[PDB]
Amino acid sequence: GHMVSCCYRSLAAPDLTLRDLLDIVETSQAHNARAQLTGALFYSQGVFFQWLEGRPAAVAEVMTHIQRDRRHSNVEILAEEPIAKRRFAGWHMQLSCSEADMRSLGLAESRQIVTV
Amino acid sequence: AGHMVSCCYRSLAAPDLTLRDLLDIVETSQAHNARAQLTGALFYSQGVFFQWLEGRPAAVAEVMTHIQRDRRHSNVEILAEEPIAKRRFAGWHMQLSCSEADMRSLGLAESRQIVTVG
Numbered sequence: 609g610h611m612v613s614c615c616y617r618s619l620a621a622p623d624l625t626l627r628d629l630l631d632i633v634e635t636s637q638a639h640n641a642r643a644q645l646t647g648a649l650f651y652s653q654g655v656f657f658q659w660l661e662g663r664p665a666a667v668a669e670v671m672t673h674i675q676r677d678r679r680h681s682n683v684e685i686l687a688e689e690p691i692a693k694r695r696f697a698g699w700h701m702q703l704s705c706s707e708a709d710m711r712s713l714g715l716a717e718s719r720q721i722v723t724v
Numbered sequence: 725a726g727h728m729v730s731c732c733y734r735s736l737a738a739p740d741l742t743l744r745d746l747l748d749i750v751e752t753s754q755a756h757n758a759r760a761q762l763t764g765a766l767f768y769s770q771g772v773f774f775q776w777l778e779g780r781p782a783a784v785a786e787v788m789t790h791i792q793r794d795r796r797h798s799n800v801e802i803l804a805e806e807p808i809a810k811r812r813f814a815g816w817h818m819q820l821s822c823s824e825a826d827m828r829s830l831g832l833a834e835s836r837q838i839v840t841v842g
């Protein structure tokens with residue numbers, strides 16, 4: 609019971625950008641593997657959802673950076689608790705993209721037909 | 725009183741999960757969760773179930789007893805149980821992310837047809 613898990617949800621900045629998501633992914637993947645932080649970040653449809661677990665001080669501090677990040681707002685901690693055993697293997701990223709986010713990147717589906 | 729709890733778990737979907745199984749889970753859950761006033765959501769993606777459930781402590785603990793011994797998934801890991809003042813979900817629903825490999829496991833395929841229109 610010498611570790612914590614932390615779980616929060618937040619709302620993306622409405623002007624969040626691909627670059628932003630790309631910065632968050634890259635930063636996230638590298639610091640967490642180094643701080644021994646295990647868990648998962650999900651982004652779908654303007655909402656973030658994240659689990660983190662590890663040393664209490666390493667979680668307490670990554671959450672400190674996260675709670676002041678202007679890339680999201682309304683950071684709502686859903687579960688904080690002493691764990692004795694990590695319940696996630698390393699760090700997992702899962703970003704899903706709807707048609708809305710697609711039209712909202714200038715992107716569209718297109719079928720290619722080539723004469724062969 | 726009318727205090728409420730929230731429980732969240734992840735699990736591994738049975739390798740041999742079938743469309744019938746998903747039909748059963750959805751029909752059963754919808755019917756019982758409405759009767760027992762359990763709100764939340766079940767997610768399926770790339771072999772994993774994740775469920776969020778809310779309601780009265782006895783109603784959540786009861787459904788979790790059943791969920792935990794259900795042979796349609798294994799490795800049920802409770803991730804959070806927390807007191808809540810209010811529900812974050814209005815009702816209940818299942819959300820499924822369906823891959824090419826999901827399709828083929830269920831013995832299904834899409835086929836496209838071309839159709840004249842105005």
Ligand SMILES: Cc1cc2nc3c(=O)[nH]c(=O)nc-3n(C[C@H](O)[C@H](O)[C@H](O)COP(=O)(O)O)c2cc1C
Binds near residue numbers: 636639640677679
């Ligand atoms: C939704 C969201 C999730 C994030 N998740 C992580 C993460 O798990 N690990 C991490 O090191 N930084 C994460 N960050 C980025 C940090 O808030 C922050 O940019 C990073 O710790 C570097 O801080 P610094 O700019 O003061 O050096 C996340 C940011 C957002 C908006």
Ligand SMILES: Cc1cc2nc3c(=O)[nH]c(=O)nc-3n(C[C@H](O)[C@H](O)[C@H](O)COP(=O)(O)O)c2cc1C
Binds near residue numbers: 754757787792
């Ligand atoms: C991943 C998964 C999620 C489930 N979620 C619920 C649920 O939210 N509510 C529910 O009543 N049963 C749920 N069940 C079904 C129960 O485990 C159990 O089969 C049911 O309560 C008893 O069904 P019966 O009355 O038809 O015998 C779930 C099962 C699985 C495999």
Ligand SMILES: CCCCCCCCCCCC[N+](C)(C)CC(=O)[O-]
Binds near residue numbers: 822824827834
């Ligand atoms: C019982 C209700 C059956 C509904 C079938 C819907 C599942 C379709 C999945 C198709 C997967 C194709 N992928 C994901 C690759 C996208 C595409 O090619 O358009």
